[PDB]
């Protein structure tokens, strides 16, 4: 869905760091804590939150609207690649008159140190 | 507020209170390794649920991190232990919620059982009550702190009030408090962390019935020493 | 309403209180051996336990006094031997035990005609301070296979034990009663904690009743005094 992704489809090899900012779009009166944690490749998905906490992790409170942004160290080409998981550290809490369900948008880009190398035209159409 | 690979987000402009006016220092005595690498980061205990019927919670240190963290791997492999703690208790509520949390630190928190009847004859409390791990344990009789010691005077210990109307976080820094410069880790619990409702949670119906108590803590000046078991 | 010396740690604790009484009757079921062993209990004096438990860590000297008479308060020509048995050394079991002769157990030889014996016991604990509250277990080992009644137990606060007996090979001619008074001297207290709320049920643990009580509830209603 990213422009980065569609561009990476036009090359075969790439290496860099990526930024992924998450944007909470709930009510203003809504608060809560989410636990974002990135686990490096090879190692499997952490079984629970507590075990996920003992690794690279980021505590996200809704005192910050969107400013929480994960920076993943390195991406290569030959669990081939590491996966980031988002966890409920704390239940969604709202007052009365506030919606009990909220949606959050993820936005992602590459840092300055990101590059692509060998070119390949792989587009569906036409 | 980032220390190591751990990143937590909280207010860095609150009322940080130091226990008995003394920061955790390194032992420069004769009783005897000082790790501050992956034993320096923030450990975040699973969230508890502040509720109307809640009686209160307590955690025993350093037992809470015995099995849960890398901190534990150094505490279970060394027969000697010494460390301070940075405790940060924060709950997230809305302007439509009420409550008042007393977060306190009572060193040598010995738990007691009960013994009713014409003849009093009781046993001694189990490990789950004595050393409840990171899960903690709910108070049985909060008014006497499960020890015949009145919570009415708990404020004589390192304390902070959490008023959902006023506060949101409580920060307590506790130094290594003990009669010996170095003690065991899996045997002696230097202190207990009390988080008890004085003014109970209330809200008009329709609001989220559980306010999330989050405990983020990190050992300030951990110094295990001893030798490797 | 001017001097604050009244409320110091020293003047609060320093006061010789009756801490235990030894009974050496002429004939009875209590002490048919004409001797007794009294382990030093600070909680011998009633109000003292709730007092010292205001703090967690403490340190003090103790001055012991021995008021000895017959159960009528009559003083009799009898020679007494008060022996102090340090934490290490073992307590005497028989009246002819070799514990009464062992020098490293200091002894006091007085008469009832002589004014009450008075000695001073230094801070005995191997730790830097006494400890009425131990949230854990004494041993530093994986031993967890027995009934852990060692919770709250802290055998480092052991102050030793006195051993009272009637001097001589033959049993005493008079019925005696020896009263022991302890007075705390140089005192330092460390970590303050709330004062006892409920009645004490046991000796080595802060257990309480199945039915909790309260300090006082005079006010029948909040409105009216």
Is B37 exposed, middle or buried, given 0-12, 13-18 or 19+ CB atoms closer than 10 A?
A: exposed
- DSSP-assigned states of every residue in B10-49: --SSS--EETTS-------SS------STTSSPEEEEEEE
Cα B71 to Cα B64: distance, rounded to the nearest angstrom: 10
Sign of CA dihedral B181, B184, B187, B189: positive
The Cα B139–Cα B55 span in angstroms is 6
Query: Measuring CA to CA, how many Å separate B104 from each of B23, B24, C54, C208?
Result: 17, 17, 17, 22
Q: Residue B39: its chain A contacts at CB < 8 A? A: none
With the CA atoms of C128, C130, C133 and C139 taken in that order, what torsion angle do they form, in degrees rounded to the nearest 10? 60
3-state SS assignment for residue A64: coil
CATH of B1-229, one of 3.90.1110.10, 2.170.150.20, 2.60.120.20, 3.30.300.180: 2.60.120.20
The domain containing residue C58 runs over which residues? 1-225
Distance of alpha carbon B38 from alpha carbon B79, whole angstroms: 20
Q: Cα angle vertex B157, ends B181, B128, to 5°?
A: 75
Q: Which residues of A touch B94 (CB under 8 A)?
A: 29-31, 93-95, 98
- What is C67-127 written as a DSSP string? EEE-TTS---S-EEEEEEE-SSSPPP-STT-TTTT-TTS-EEEEETTS--EEEEE----SS
Q: Which residue of chain B has the CA closest to A52?
A: B44
Domain of C56, CATH number, reads: 2.60.120.20
- Say how far apart CA C110 and CA C80 lie, in whole Å: 5
Min distance A46 CA to chain B CA atoms (Å): 14
Segment holding C48, helix H or strand E: helix C48-52
CB pair distance less than 8 Å for C135 and B157: no
Query: Mind spelling out the 3-state secondary structure of B183-196?
Result: ECCCCECCEEEEEE
Q: Is A88 helix (H, G, I), strand (E, B) or coil?
A: strand
Contact residues for C118 (Cβ-Cβ < 8 A; gap 6+): C63, C64, C65, C66
Asked if the Cβ–Cβ distance from B7 to A33 is below 8 Å, we say: no
| A33/B214 touch (CB, cutoff 8 Å), yes or no | yes
Q: In Å, how far from its chain's centre is CA C170?
A: 30
Question: For chain C, give me the number of helices (H) and strands (E)?
Answer: 2, 9
Data resolution in angstroms: 3.8
For chain A, helix (H) and strand (E) counts, in that order, are: 2, 7
Taking the C-alpha atoms of residue C77 and residue A96, their distance in angstroms, rounded to an integer, is: 88
In DSSP terms, B169 is beta-bridged to B90
Q: How far is A55 from chain B (nearest CA, A)?
A: 7
Provide the token pair at C117: 């014996």
Rounded Cα–Cα distance for residues C162 and C178 (Å): 12
CA gap C123, B179 in Å, rounded: 14
Report the DSSP beta bridge partners of residue B2: B7
SS3 content of chain A, % helix, strand, coil (to 5): 10, 40, 50
H-helix segments, A33-112: 49-53
Domain ranges of chain B: 1-229
Name the structure determination technique: X-ray
Is the bond into B62 cis (omega within 30 degrees of 0)? yes
* Contact status, residue B145 vs residue B56, Cβ threshold 8 Å: no
Q: How many residues does chain A have?
A: 126
Quote the longest CA-to-CA distance of chain A: 56
CB atoms within 10 A of CB C204: 15
Q: Which helix (H) or strand (E) holds B74?
A: helix B70-75
3-state SS, residue C196: coil
Answer yes or no: do B212 and A32 touch at CB < 8 A.
yes
Write the CB contacts of A42 (distance below 8 Å, at least 6 apart in sequence). Answer: A79, A82
Could you give the number of structural domains in chain C? 1
Distance, CA of C184 to CA of A52 (rounded, Å): 55
- 8 Å CB contact of C131 and B108: yes
Asked whether the beta carbons of C210 and B115 are under 8 A apart, the reply is yes
Which residues of chain C approach chain B closer than 8 Å at the C-beta?
56-57, 127-131, 133-137, 139-140, 148-149, 151-152, 191-202, 205-212, 215
Beta bridge partners of A34: A60, A88
The closest of C138, C18, A87, C134 to B192, measured between CA atoms, is C134
Cβ-defined contact of C191 to B20 (cutoff 8 Å): yes
DSSP 8-state class, residue B91: E
Cis amide prior to A126 (ω within 30 degrees): yes
- Residue of C127, C133, C207 lying closest to B108 (CB–CB): C133
């Amino acid at each position: 869905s990213t422009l980065l992704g569609q561009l990476c489809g036009y090359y075969t090899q790439w290496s860099g760091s990526l930024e992924v900012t998450f944007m909470f779009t709930g009510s203003f009166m809504a608060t809560g804590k989410m636990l974002i944690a990135y686990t490096p490749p090879g190692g499997p998905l952490p079984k629970d939150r507590a075990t996920a906490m003992l690794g690279t992790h980021v505590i996200w409170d809704f005192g910050l609207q969107s400013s929480v942004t994960l920076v993943i160290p390195w991406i290569s080409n030959t669990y081939t690649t590491g996966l980031v998981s988002i966890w409920y550290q704390t239940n969604y809490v709202v007052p009365i008159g506030a919606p009990n369900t909220a949606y959050i948008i993820a936005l992602a880009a590459a840092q300055k140190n990101f590059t692509m190398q060998l070119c390949k035209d792989a587009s569906d159409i036409l | 507020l980032t220390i190591g690979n751990s990143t937590i987000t909280t207010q860095e402009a609150a009322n940080i209170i130091v226990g008995y006016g003394e920061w955790p220092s390194y032992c420069s005595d004769s009783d005897a390794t000082r790790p501050d690498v992956s034993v320096n980061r923030f450990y975040t205990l699973d969230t508890k649920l502040w509720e109307k019927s809640s009686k209160g919670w307590y955690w025993k240190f350093p037992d809470v991190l015995t099995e849960t963290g890398v901190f534990g791997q150094n505490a279970q492999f060394h027969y000697l232990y010494r460390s301070g703690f940075c405790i940060h208790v924060q709950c997230n509520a809305s302007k439509f919620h009420q409550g008042a949390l007393l977060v306190a630190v009572l060193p040598e928190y010995v738990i007691g059982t009960v013994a009713g009847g014409t003849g009093t004859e009781d046993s001694h409390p189990p490990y789950k009550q004595t050393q409840p791990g990171a899960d903690g344990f709910e108070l049985q009789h909060p008014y006497v702190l499960d020890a015949g010691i009145p919570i009415s005077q708990l404020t004589v210990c390192p304390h902070q009030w959490i008023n959902l109307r006023t506060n949101n976080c409580a920060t307590i820094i506790v130094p290594y408090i003990n009669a010996l410069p170095f003690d065991s880790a899996l045997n002696h619990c230097n202190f207990g962390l009390l988080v008890v409702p004085i003014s109970p949670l209330d809200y008009d119906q329709g609001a989220t019935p559980v306010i999330p108590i989050t405990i983020t803590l990190a050992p300030m000046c951990s110094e295990f020493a001893g030798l490797r078991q | 309403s001017h001097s604050t010396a009244e409320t110091t740690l020293d003047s609060f604790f320093s006061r010789a209180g009756l801490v235990g009484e030894i009974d050496l009757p002429l004939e009875g079921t209590t002490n048919p051996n004409g001797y007794a062993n009294w382990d030093i209990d600070i909680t011998g004096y009633a109000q003292m336990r709730r007092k010292v438990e205001l703090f967690t860590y403490m340190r003090f000297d103790a001055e012991f006094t021995f008021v000895a008479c017959t159960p009528t308060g009559e003083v009799v020509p009898q020679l007494l031997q008060y022996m102090f048995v340090p934490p290490g050394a073992p307590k005497p079991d028989s009246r002819e035990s070799l514990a009464w002769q062992t020098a490293t157990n200091p002894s006091v030889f007085v008469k009832l005609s002589d004014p009450p014996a008075q000695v001073s016991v230094p801070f005995m604990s191997p730790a830097s301070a006494y400890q009425w509250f131990y949230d854990g277990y004494p041993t530093f080992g994986e031993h967890k296979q027995e009934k852990d009644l060692e919770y709250g137990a802290c055998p480092n606060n052991m102050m030793g034990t006195f051993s009272v007996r009637t001097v001589g090979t033959s049993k005493s001619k008079y019925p005696l009663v020896v009263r022991i008074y302890m007075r705390m001297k140089h005192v330092r207290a460390w970590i303050p904690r709330p004062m006892r709320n409920q009645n004490y049920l046991f000796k080595a643990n802060p257990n309480y009743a199945g039915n909790s009580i309260k300090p006082t509830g005079a006010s029948r209603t909040a409105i009216t005094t």
